[PDB]
């Protein structure tokens, strides 16, 4: 089993999850949340130290190259790089930190891949304006991104505007797992819109810069996991069909095709929840599409027709039109209550092939979280994470079938190289190829890392 030439191999992380708040000038939504309610975080570990990459980025990258990685994706924190949001002034220390990060990639022969926003809106922006509810903030985010392009576009040729903006939509305005953790469909939907707008506006800005800083590729990091219907009935089918229009299609269509999905707009109007837009806005969005995409995948989704239809709703919610469905006999990860079903990666590959023009995309996150890794140390102290190996392998296998079948997939990233801080779960579940001891910050490669090195170095399975 062999992969194309130039295939990205490596893993993904983020600024907020790897750095620590060392020297960080502002607080992002999660930093604020942790200072206010540290009881909400597993074992009371918040993001102050996280995985210490503010100190250890250089040695991390050396370890990763020695483990066969040719690329690395992390994120630049709005709250680290920018002094004054309003004018996007530069914080020199912030600036010197990310240059260390870029230069250390290149220096180790690791293509630097950069995301601009990973659930880390500055709290001050939410307080003043309602954050992503505001098109002003969208402008500030746009200004933040020109700075990055200006300062890093010389070395960084691979840009992504958001990590999974629907997760922000949901966590913040629907399911209560991002601050502000409010329930409000109307705000959810507008914020969806703004994130999509931000995306086109950022892509616009990137593409206006001088030749030497705009000869890279830019896109966004989405999801495309299917919503498998419980059966082939027409009510279950309509449920899945909606689950995808909301969960997958809304952002996918904006990024790849220049448009929002009509069917979805009609439902939103019929429900008095449609977003405020501007024909000038819709055109920027038509004009600025991604060069490419990352799709993250951890678990399938499964839906049925709702057991109960309510006549009045406190708040609007795509979950009107569907319920979760468990499939008798499915394989599962207990620690996380997630179904393991790698075949879905093949389906994601085909869906890109036939419905999003087979534009290039990579699998930007794939990984498995387990919670007591100390139980799998061998007499050498190393974690023997045979489960992680099997998981990554199976998903990689299907990704291969997907490529073999004509899908324009250029890469695979494991979430995550070194155990990192997973939000409310913190360090409960570990995802890393390389162990991290959150007390001493000492890294230490698990079996999975050596299996992955073999895969990466020889470009095959």
Residue with tokens 């036939």: 354
Asked if 133 and 191 touch (Cβ cutoff 8 Å), the reply is yes
Distance of alpha carbon 325 from alpha carbon 85, whole angstroms: 44
Distance of alpha carbon 445 from alpha carbon 452, whole angstroms: 11
**Quick one: how far is CA 185 from the chain centroid?**
22
CA distances from 380 to 63, 376, 384 (A): 19, 11, 10
Tell me the CB-side half-sphere exposure of residue 161, using CA atoms within 13 A. 33
Distance of alpha carbon 456 from alpha carbon 417, whole angstroms: 13
* Sheet (strand 301-304) strand order: 227-229, 301-304, 323-324
Residue with tokens 């929002």: 260
- The verdict on whether 365 is a catalytic residue reads yes
Phi/psi for 326 (5° steps) reads -95, 140
Residues 6+ apart with CB under 8 A from 200: 254, 284, 285, 287, 288, 289
Residue ranges of the domains in the chain?
1-461
Instruction: Tell me which of 164, 281, 339, 435 is the catalytic residue.
Output: 164
**Quick one: how far is CA 191 from the chain centroid?**
17
Instruction: Tell me which of 170, 339, 365, 435 is the catalytic residue.
Output: 365
What are the contacts of 347-350 at 24+ separation with CB within 8 A?
347/226, 348/224, 348/225, 348/226, 348/295, 348/297, 348/402, 349/398, 349/399, 349/401, 349/402, 349/403, 349/405, 349/407, 349/409, 350/402, 350/405, 350/407
Distance of alpha carbon 336 from alpha carbon 429, whole angstroms: 8
Question: How would you write the chain as a 3-class SS string?
Answer: CECCCCCEEEEECCHHHHCCCCCCCCCEHHHHHHHHCHHHCHHHCCCCCCCCHHHHHHHHHHHHHCCCCCEEEEECCHHHHECCCCCCCECHHHHHHHHHHHHHHHHHCCEEEEECCCCCCEHHHHHHHCHHHCHHHHHHHHHHHHHHHHHHCCCCCEEEEEECHHHHHHHHHCCCCCCCCCCCHHHHHHHHHHHHHHHHHHHHHHHHCCHHHCCCEEEEEECCCCEEECCCCHHHHHHHHHHHHHHHHHHHHHHHHCCCCHHHHHHHHHCCCCCCCCHHHHHHHHHCCCCEEEEECCCCEEEECCCCCCCCCCCCCHHHCCEECCCCCCEEEHHHCEEECCHHHHHHHHHHHHHCCCCCEEEEEECCCECCHHHHECCCCCECCHHHHHHHHHHHHHHHHHHHCCCCEEEEEECCCECCCCHHHCCCCECCCEEECCCCCCEEECHHHHHHHHHHHCCEC
Residue with tokens 């299917």: 226
> In this structure, what token pair is assigned to residue 56?
């250890």
How many other C-beta atoms are found inside a 10 Å radius of the C-beta of residue 315? 14
Distance of alpha carbon 257 from alpha carbon 352, whole angstroms: 12
Using CA atoms of 200, 202, 205, 210 in order, give the dihedral in degrees to the nearest 10.
Answer: -120
Judged on CB neighbours under 10 Å (0-12, 13-18, 19+), 229 is buried
CA distances from 259 to 19, 214, 250 (A): 36, 24, 9
Is the peptide bond between 180 and the residue preceding it cis, with omega within 30 degrees of 0? yes
- Range 1-461: architecture per CATH: Alpha-Beta Barrel (3.20)
Sign, CA dihedral 178-356-351-270, equals positive
Per-position b or e across 14-52, b if 16+ CB within 10 A of its CB: bbbbbbbbeebebbbbbbbbbeeeeebbbeebbbebbbb
- The verdict on whether 435 is a catalytic residue reads no
Residues 6+ apart with CB under 8 A from 270: none
CA distances from 418 to 142, 151, 336, 344, 430 (A): 30, 27, 19, 26, 9
Distance of alpha carbon 378 from alpha carbon 395, whole angstroms: 26
Stated resolution in angstroms: 2.5
Asked if 50 and 441 touch (Cβ cutoff 8 Å), the reply is no
């Amino acid at each position: 089993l062999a992969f194309p030439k130039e295939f990205w191999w490596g893993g993904a992380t983020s600024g907020p999850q790897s750095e620590g708040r060392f020297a960080k000038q502002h607080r992002n939504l999660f930093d604020y949340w942790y200072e206010e309610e540290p009881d909400l975080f597993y074992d009371y570990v918040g993001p102050d130290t996280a995985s210490d990459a503010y100190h250890q980025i250089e040695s991390d990258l050396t370890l990763l190259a020695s483990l066969g990685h040719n690329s690395y994706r992390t994120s630049i924190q709005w709250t680290r790089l920018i002094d004054d949001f309003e004018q996007a002034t530069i914080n020199p220390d912030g600036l010197a930190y990310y240059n260390r990060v870029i230069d250390a990639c290149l220096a180790n022969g690791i293509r630097p891949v950069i995301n601009l926003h990973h659930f880390d809106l500055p709290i001050a922006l939410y307080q003043a304006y309602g954050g992503w509810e505001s098109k002003h903030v969208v402008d500030l985010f746009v200004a933040f991104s020109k700075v990055c392009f200006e300062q890093f576009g010389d070395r960084v040729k691979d840009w992504f505007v958001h990590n999974e903006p629907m997760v922000v939509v949901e966590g913040s305005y629907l399911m209560q797992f991002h601050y502000p953790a409010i329930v409000d469909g109307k705000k959810a939907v507008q914020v969806a819109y703004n994130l999509a707008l931000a995306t086109a506006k950022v892509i616009q800005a990137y593409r206006r810069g001088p030749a030497e800083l705009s000869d890279g590729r830019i896109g966004t990091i989405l999801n495309l996991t299917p919503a498998y219907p419980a059966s082939q009935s027409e009510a279950d089918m309509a449920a899945a069909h909606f689950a995808e229009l909301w969960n997958n299609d809304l952002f996918m269509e904006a990024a790849v095709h220049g448009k929002f999905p009509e069917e979805l707009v009609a439902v939103l109007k019929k429900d008095g929840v449609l977003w405020q837009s501007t024909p000038e806005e819709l055109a920027l969005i038509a004009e600025n599409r991604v060069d490419y995409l990352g799709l993250n995948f951890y678990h399938p989704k499964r839906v049925k027709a709702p057991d109960a239809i309510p006549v009045i709703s406190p708040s609007w919610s795509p979950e009107w039109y569907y319920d979760p469905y468990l499939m008798p006999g499915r394989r599962m990860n207990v620690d996380k209550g997630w179904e393991i079903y790698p075949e879905a990666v093949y389906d994601i590959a085909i869906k890109m092939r036939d419905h999003y023009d087979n534009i290039p995309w990579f699998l930007s996150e794939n990984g498995v979280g387990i919670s007591g890794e100390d139980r799998y140390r061998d007499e050498t102290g190393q974690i023997q994470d045979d489960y992680r190996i099997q998981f990554l392998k199976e998903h990689l296998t299907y990704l291969h079938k997907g490529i073999e079948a004509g899908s324009n997939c250029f890469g695979y990233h494991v979430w995550t190289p070194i155990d990192g801080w997973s939000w409310l779960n913190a360090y409960k579940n570990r995802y890393g190829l390389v162990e991290n001891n959150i007390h001493t910050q000492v890294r230490r490669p698990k079996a999975s890392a050596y299996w992955f090195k073999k895969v990466a170095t020889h470009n095959r399975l």
